[PDB]
Amino acid sequence: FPKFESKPQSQEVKENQTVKFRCEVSGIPKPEVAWFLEGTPVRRQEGSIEVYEDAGSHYLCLLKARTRDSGTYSCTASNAQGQLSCSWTLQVERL
């Protein structure tokens, strides 16, 4: 069943900085991790947004954080037996 072993925490940061969110999911078969911003999926870009798995940890990274990225973020681990979801916030500052 999908469980969260380590949830991403909220972070307030300056503009254009790198942000990293780390979901860590356990479960049988393999919880498919999906990320969202206020209910909208957060999909990867060429070199702006990236979503990947590395050493059992799922990641979301904004390498150049803009003010449009502020808001409530969510992560959903999902397999054939269920769906487990959690949330946190991002605050991108200006000058």
Residue numbers of the domain that contains 56: 1-95
Roughly how many angstroms between the first and final C-alpha of the chain, as a whole number?
Answer: 45
HSE, CB side, 13 Å, CA atoms: give it for residue 91.
4
Asked how this structure was determined, the answer is X-ray
Length of the chain: 95
- Give how many domains the chain has, as a whole number: 1
Alpha-carbon distances, residue 13 vs 16, 17, 62, 64 (angstroms)? 9, 7, 11, 11
Separation of alpha carbons 68 and 77, rounded Å: 25
Q: How far apart are CA 8 and CA 30, in angstroms?
A: 19
Q: Which amino acid is at 14?
A: K
- Taking alpha carbons only, the member of 8, 11, 14 closest to residue 60 is 8
Resolution (A): 2.5
Decide if 1 contacts 68 (C-beta within 8 A).
Answer: no
